[PDB]
Amino acid sequence: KYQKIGDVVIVCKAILLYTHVKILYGKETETIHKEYGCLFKLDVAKIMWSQGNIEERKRMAFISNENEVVVDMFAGIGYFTIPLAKYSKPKLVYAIEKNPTAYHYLCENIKLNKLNNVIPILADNRDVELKDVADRVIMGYVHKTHKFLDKTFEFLKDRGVIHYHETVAEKIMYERPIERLKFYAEKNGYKLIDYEVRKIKKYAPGVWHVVVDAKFERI
Numbered sequence: 375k376y377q378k379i380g381d382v383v384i385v386c387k388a389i390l391l392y393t394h395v396k397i398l399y400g401k402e403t404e405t406i407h408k409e410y411g412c413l414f415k416l417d418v419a420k421i422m423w424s425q426g427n428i429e430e431r432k433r434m435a436f437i438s439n440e441n442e443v444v445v446d447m448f449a450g451i452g453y454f455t456i457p458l459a460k461y462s463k464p465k466l467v468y469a470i471e472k473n474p475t476a477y478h479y480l481c482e483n484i485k486l487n488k489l490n491n492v493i494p495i496l497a498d499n500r501d502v503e504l505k506d507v508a509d510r511v512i513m514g515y516v517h518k519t520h521k522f523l524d525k526t527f528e529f530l531k532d533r534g535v536i537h538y539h540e541t542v543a544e545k546i547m548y549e550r551p552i553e554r555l556k557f558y559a560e561k562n563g564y565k566l567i568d569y570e571v572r573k574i575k576k577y578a579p580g581v582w583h584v585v586v587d588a589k590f591e592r593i
């Protein structure tokens with residue numbers, strides 16, 4: 375098919391691209407994309423917009439509440455941060471993003487959506503120092519995500535929930551993510567209270583991208 379992002383078509387509009395990006399008509403790859411009330415400015419030539427993650431972005435929108443402080447550890451241009459900040463209206467969301475280009479757009483997007491409860495941080499989340507401030511932490515990343523749990527447990531309050539993503543073989547999809555969480559919980563002085571595992575999309579033959587919603591309290 376063909377993805378229409380903002381005024382840009384990926385294969386009338388402003389311009390269109392071929393996906394490693396080649397221009398087929400025009401010069402400008404930057405646009406503002408509107409999804410479920412939210413505006414996302416990005417350069418479609420240097421920032422990818424994932425079709426298959428739409429359901430999770432919709433789910434994150436209302437996952438919080440006005441009593442919460444939320445840390446988004448892999449914020450990007452604000453895929454989760456923006457909807458969550460708008461529809462859950464938490465007290466505050468720390469949106470950490472390591473890549474300077476994606477960070478630029480995270481910054482524009484907070485402004486575009488007129489959000490006053492978001493603080494963007496340009497950094498590797500492992501370098502950020504936010505002790506015991508988070509009611510909720512989102513880990514939307516699938517590359518050795520478990521290696522980041524030591525940090526997410528630092529962020530977490532005495533009690534809170536982590537949204538942990540992993541890609542995992544179907545056979546152990548309800549097992550491995552959980553044992554990893556329990557290992558790092560104990561490592562950091564927390565214990566697992568309850569959890570739920572949800573599928574997000576087939577990541578590869580036999581392998582699922584999953585998200586586990588897990589609640590912890592320390593001791």
Ligand SMILES: C[S@@+](CC[C@H](N)C(=O)[O-])C[C@H]1O[C@@H](n2cnc3c(N)ncnc32)[C@H](O)[C@@H]1O
Binds near residue numbers: 471472497499
């Ligand atoms: C943009 S999200 C992808 C989400 C999904 N593709 C979607 O469309 O909803 C992943 C982001 O995490 C960022 N990232 C990777 N490692 C990081 C780290 N250690 N600390 C903070 N951000 C990181 C990457 O730059 C990337 O922008």
